[model samples]
Target: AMGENEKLINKIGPNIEMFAQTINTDIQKIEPNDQFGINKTLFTEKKDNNIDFMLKDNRLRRLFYSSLNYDENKIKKLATILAQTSSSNDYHYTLIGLIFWTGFKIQEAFESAVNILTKDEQKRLIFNFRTKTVKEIQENFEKLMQERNSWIKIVDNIIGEYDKNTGGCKADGKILGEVIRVGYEHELDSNKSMQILNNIETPL
Candidate 1:
């Protein structure tokens, strides 16, 4: 089992990096101010503006609406949480892009991703990745991969529904699962993961 997991990780690692790069490049073209109608006070006083803008963005709003099984209230709630957690325009946009491409159950995936690291680690990984050195990030990645089985299980649960093709889109669950799995293995910040997902060619 351990050997199999190792092999899978090796296979998925490159793919994840590829997708993350794509997501990053695509997001770079999106002028947050124009695309989301973000104003100067978006991250400070008018935090709700983030959610409002997200909901107003036609593509994102529709994707969130559909991915969450058309639950309007849940979309609002999720957007609110995302807005609160996000620290910048790029981070916010990267997160939304990640969610759109992954096609995982929004609530569960968020919860599982959050639970993967303790509070401090999560903060460092999400908000401080820019400041942290590559060695630090690599160390944390290695530590997280110690419990690879658990992470794989979490991916399985979040992706199980889609794997059955009961969902609207016929997403490649194995590839998506590997994306999440490899994302965890690398402890990739939203920006990096978003880039990787964009480069990926798999159907959503």
Candidate 2:
């Protein structure tokens, strides 16, 4: 029996390209080596502008935007995560430091782990670099998994649970749940995307 009417189509895979223009072009893509375009050495254009990328949502979204890379959003997100920290993360130019705050928030900002990028961004940052999902997940998957293990281990090393009633990682769990919701979209080609983004356009 055909189970219900669930539209099925071959997904073009999850696309998350960041470009510097409304219409995507090769020249628009920021250099992979560019660290958030803080320095313009690797690329001709400066991120102090806009960034365009294909999202799993099938719509292009810009983050540090405003003709200034995606937008000031990254900084905003970073600020929220690093509201309270022991030492200033002044040298985390690669956005990893920001990401570290993103994953576990401050107090755990240990400065450097696996390069500045991995140390800051943690598992979440690695997800962005995962070019392909099922195509060849061996390297990406293993690396990502290991990163997670390392992250928890690091957190464990710091912050011993004060009181059972205090709920130590409650915030982390809440944010992580939201992260999972967002992560579901990564596998856009499989039942993953449709499970979240499957919408049938109706003709009026």
Maximum-lDDT candidate: 1
Judging by TM-score against the true structure, name the best candidate.
1
Return the TM-score for each candidate structure.
0.25, 0.19
Question: Which RMSD does model 2 reach against the true structure?
Answer: 18.0
Q: What clash pairs does model 1 have?
A: 19-195, 19-196, 19-197, 20-195, 20-196, 21-195, 21-196, 23-194, 23-195, 24-195
lDDT values for all models: 0.37, 0.26
Once superposed on the true structure, which residue ranges of model 1 sit more than 4 Å away at CA?
A: 1-60, 87-93, 103-204
What are the clash counts of all predictions, listed in order?
10, 20
Q: Please give, for residues 63-150, the per-residue lDDT of candidate 1 as tens digits.
A: 3343344444444443333333332244444433454334322322322332333334433434433323323433334433323324
Instruction: Give the distance in Å from residue 59's predicted Cα in candidate 2 to where it truly belongs.
Output: 16
Off by over 4 Å in 2: 1-136, 160-204
Tens digits of per-residue lDDT for model 2 on 1-204? 011111110011111112112324422555333233422242123221211121111122222221122333453432333222222332212222333322322111211111222222333333343333222322332333344444444333222231121233335533332332243222212222122121111100
In lDDT terms, how accurate is model 1? 0.37
